[PDB]
Amino acid sequence: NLYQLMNMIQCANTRTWPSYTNYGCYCGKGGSGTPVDDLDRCCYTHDHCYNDAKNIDGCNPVTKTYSYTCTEPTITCNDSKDKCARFVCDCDRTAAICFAKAPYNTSNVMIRSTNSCQ
Ligand SMILES: CCCCCCCCCCCCC(=O)O
Ligand code: NA
- Ligand 2 centroid–CA 6 distance in Å is 15
Kindly state if the Cβ of 30 falls inside 6 Å of ligand 1: no
State the Cα–Cα distance between residues 19 and 39, nearest whole angstrom.
11
Where on the phi/psi map is residue 97: left (φ > 0), alpha (ψ -120 to 50), or beta? alpha
Any bridge partners for residue 23, and if so which? 27
Query: Any residues with CB less than 8 A from the CB of 81 and at least 6 apart, and which?
Result: none
List the one residue out of 97, 106, 88 whose CA is nearest residue 24. 106
State the Cα–Cα distance between residues 109 and 5, nearest whole angstrom.
20
List the one residue out of 18, 3, 7, 2 whose CA is nearest residue 76. 7
Kindly state if the Cβ of 44 falls inside 6 Å of ligand 1: no
Question: Amino acid letter at 14?
Answer: T
- Ligand 1 centroid–CA 22 distance in Å is 7
92 is catalytic: yes
With contact defined as beta carbons under 8 Å apart, do 63 and 3 qualify?
no
What's the Cα-to-Cα distance from 25 to each of 7, 37, 61, rounded to whole Å? Answer: 22, 9, 21
Kindly state if the Cβ of 21 falls inside 6 Å of ligand 1: yes
Determine the 3-state secondary structure of 55 from DSSP.
Answer: coil
48 is catalytic: no
State the Cα–Cα distance between residues 74 and 54, nearest whole angstrom.
26
Query: What is the CATH architecture assignment of 1-118?
Result: Up-down Bundle (1.20)
State the Cα–Cα distance between residues 57 and 95, nearest whole angstrom.
23
State the Cα–Cα distance between residues 37 and 113, nearest whole angstrom.
16
Any bridge partners for residue 34, and if so which? none
List the one residue out of 118, 116, 46, 115 whose CA is nearest residue 87. 46
Solved with: X-ray
With contact defined as beta carbons under 8 Å apart, do 108 and 21 qualify?
no
State the Cα–Cα distance between residues 58 and 38, nearest whole angstrom.
31
User: Using DSSP, how many helices (H) and how many strands (E) does the chain show?
Assistant: 4, 2
Residue stretches of the annotated binding site for Ca(2+): 26, 28, 30, 47
- Ligand 1 centroid–CA 29 distance in Å is 6
Question: Amino acid letter at 73?
Answer: P
